[PDB]
Design a protein around this motif. Structure first.
Motif, mmCIF file in Angstrom:
data_model
loop_
_atom_site.group_PDB
_atom_site.id
_atom_site.type_symbol
_atom_site.label_atom_id
_atom_site.label_comp_id
_atom_site.label_asym_id
_atom_site.label_seq_id
_atom_site.Cartn_x
_atom_site.Cartn_y
_atom_site.Cartn_z
ATOM 1 N N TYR A 178 0.836 -1.184 0.000
ATOM 2 C CA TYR A 178 0.000 0.000 0.000
ATOM 3 C C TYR A 178 0.881 1.248 0.000
ATOM 4 O O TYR A 178 2.045 1.218 0.410
ATOM 5 N N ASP A 227 1.184 3.870 1.667
ATOM 6 C CA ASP A 227 1.653 4.386 2.951
ATOM 7 C C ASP A 227 2.845 3.615 3.500
ATOM 8 O O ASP A 227 3.361 3.972 4.569
ATOM 9 N N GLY A 287 -10.880 2.767 2.670
ATOM 10 C CA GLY A 287 -9.762 2.260 3.441
ATOM 11 C C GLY A 287 -8.738 3.280 3.870
ATOM 12 O O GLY A 287 -7.746 2.901 4.500
ATOM 13 N N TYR A 299 -7.393 13.821 1.605
ATOM 14 C CA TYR A 299 -6.120 14.297 1.073
ATOM 15 C C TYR A 299 -6.392 15.062 -0.208
ATOM 16 O O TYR A 299 -6.906 14.488 -1.177
ATOM 17 N N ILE A 347 1.554 12.185 -2.347
ATOM 18 C CA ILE A 347 0.862 10.923 -2.614
ATOM 19 C C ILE A 347 0.764 10.636 -4.106
ATOM 20 O O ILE A 347 0.862 9.483 -4.527
ATOM 21 N N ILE A 380 -7.291 11.858 -2.338
ATOM 22 C CA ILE A 380 -7.970 10.711 -1.747
ATOM 23 C C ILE A 380 -9.135 11.209 -0.908
ATOM 24 O O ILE A 380 -8.942 11.852 0.138
HETATM 25 C C1 LIG Z 1 2.035 8.308 1.003
HETATM 26 C C2 LIG Z 1 0.650 7.712 1.096
HETATM 27 C C3 LIG Z 1 -0.084 7.796 2.267
HETATM 28 C C4 LIG Z 1 -1.369 7.265 2.372
HETATM 29 C C5 LIG Z 1 -2.113 7.385 3.682
HETATM 30 C C6 LIG Z 1 -1.933 6.621 1.260
HETATM 31 C C7 LIG Z 1 -3.310 6.006 1.366
HETATM 32 C C8 LIG Z 1 -3.127 4.606 1.909
HETATM 33 N N1 LIG Z 1 -4.386 3.910 2.131
HETATM 34 C C9 LIG Z 1 -4.655 2.746 1.538
HETATM 35 O O1 LIG Z 1 -3.912 2.217 0.711
HETATM 36 C C10 LIG Z 1 -5.960 2.071 1.946
HETATM 37 N N2 LIG Z 1 -6.773 1.939 0.707
HETATM 38 C C11 LIG Z 1 -5.662 0.680 2.521
HETATM 39 C C12 LIG Z 1 -4.716 0.674 3.684
HETATM 40 C C13 LIG Z 1 -3.381 0.959 3.668
HETATM 41 N N3 LIG Z 1 -2.852 0.844 4.928
HETATM 42 C C14 LIG Z 1 -3.845 0.458 5.791
HETATM 43 C C15 LIG Z 1 -3.793 0.205 7.160
HETATM 44 C C16 LIG Z 1 -4.963 -0.186 7.773
HETATM 45 C C17 LIG Z 1 -6.153 -0.310 7.055
HETATM 46 C C18 LIG Z 1 -6.208 -0.048 5.705
HETATM 47 C C19 LIG Z 1 -5.035 0.336 5.045
HETATM 48 C C20 LIG Z 1 -1.200 6.515 0.068
HETATM 49 C C21 LIG Z 1 -1.759 5.826 -1.157
HETATM 50 C C22 LIG Z 1 0.078 7.069 0.012
#
Ligand SMILES: Cc1cc(C)c(CCNC(=O)[C@@H](N)Cc2c[nH]c3ccccc23)c(C)c1
Length: 330
Positions: free
Chosen positions: A79, A81, A221, A226, A300, A304
């Motif tokens: 993911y 993050d 999720g 954002y 990012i 979002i």
């Molecule tokens: C730099 C950066 C930071 C963020 C916040 C994101 C969004 C990440 N958010 C997901 O990818 C969720 N759709 C799914 C998800 C990811 N980590 C989790 C932990 C617990 C429950 C669900 C999830 C992105 C794409 C990029």
């Protein structure tokens, strides 16, 4: 057919929402994070490295008389993050309320990253983005919604997330008592595998609405909202003492503040996020500085519309031949 299940915040800040899911025979109930930003149904399991399990409920396929190992199939998801998980794959019976899919791919974790281990309330994720994003290799698998869609009364599911309270995921029907006014539908691009759409603008508090196109994804999720740095700066400028902190990782504000609302556009319609929805509490235990629920997307690559935005609306994920997204106030 239809299904309906209650979704519940995992903590007092609505950091995520969990929904009970029945897997296998006899049923094994796991509390999954329904994630319209990904397309894998994965679970903590009897295979998960023991030291990476800390309070989660596990799926044990060997105890399910309907589970079958999907030979040679593995999965691995990173993911955005920095969290991740990976493992092997079973097909098994999966039900969400009264809605059942036989032969659903259930991705059993052998490894999860530390953030998943540290969250004892989430037993896995149920992906509801488009199946083109599914990570199973060498044979990509379909999402629960994709498998169920032909059987549903209408090829839709709806997200009705609560603020500090439970809410509802419905499959196959629109509950016309669950929202006010009408549902405004807006176009979706599926090319990247997401529920990608374009908001028509925003307002801060009682301010003048700014008409401007904001492309982004509807992602149940993701906790926060954002948005482009210009928009986020305009919001926090209205909060005395709010500032972007490099050390904390985003905008922080005095916990004594009462926050203004934030409005986003859906076509000609408007969804109002009440200010309290944007308060995510002290940045560390006992601090008087609080973390903001609207943050910059600059690092990012995409905007979002996470739970902060979605929980202000009744949201229709329309999986008709040409998918669309619907939003209503509630
Ligand atoms: C730099 C950066 C930071 C963020 C916040 C994101 C969004 C990440 N958010 C997901 O990818 C969720 N759709 C799914 C998800 C990811 N980590 C989790 C932990 C617990 C429950 C669900 C999830 C992105 C794409 C990029």
């Amino acid at each position: 057919s239809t299904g309906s299940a209650t979704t519940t915040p995992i903590d007092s800040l609505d950091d995520a929402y969990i929904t009970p899911v029945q897997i296998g025979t006899p049923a094994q109930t796991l509390n999954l994070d329904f994630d319209t930003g990904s397309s894998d149904l994965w679970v903590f399991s009897s295979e998960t490295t023991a030291s990476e399990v800390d309070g989660q409920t596990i799926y044990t396929p060997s105890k399910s008389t309907t589970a079958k190992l999907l030979s040679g199939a593995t999965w691995s998801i990173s993911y955005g993050d920095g969290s991740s998980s990976s493992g092997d794959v079973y097909t098994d019976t999966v039900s969400v309320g009264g809605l059942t899919v036989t032969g659903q791919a259930v991705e059993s974790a052998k490894k999860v990253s530390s953030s998943f281990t540290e969250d004892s309330t989430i037993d896995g994720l149920l992906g509801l983005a488009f199946s083109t994003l599914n990570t199973v290799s060498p044979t990509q698998q379909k999402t629960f919604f994709d498998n169920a869609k032909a059987s549903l009364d209408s090829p839709v599911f709806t997200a009705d997330l609560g603020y500090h309270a439970p809410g509802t995921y419905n499959f196959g029907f629109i509950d016309t008592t669950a929202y006010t006014g009408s549902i405004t539908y807006t176009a979706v691009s599926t090319k990247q595998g997401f529920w990608e759409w374009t908001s028509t603008g925003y307002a801060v508090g009682s301010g003048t609405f700014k008409s401007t196109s904001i492309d982004g994804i509807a992602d149940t999720g993701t906790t926060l909202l954002y948005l482009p740095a210009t928009v986020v700066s305009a919001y926090w400028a209205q909060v005395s003492g709010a500032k972007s902190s490099s050390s904390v990782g985003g905008y922080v504000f005095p916990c004594s503040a009462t926050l203004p609302s934030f409005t986003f556009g859906v076509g000609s319609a408007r969804i109002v996020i009440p200010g309290d929805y944007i308060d995510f509490g002290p940045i560390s235990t006992g601090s008087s500085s609080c973390f903001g629920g609207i943050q910059s997307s600059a690092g990012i690559g995409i905007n979002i519309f996470g739970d902060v935005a979605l929980k202000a609306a009744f949201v229709v994920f329309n999986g008709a031949t040409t998918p669309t997204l619907g939003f209503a106030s509630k």
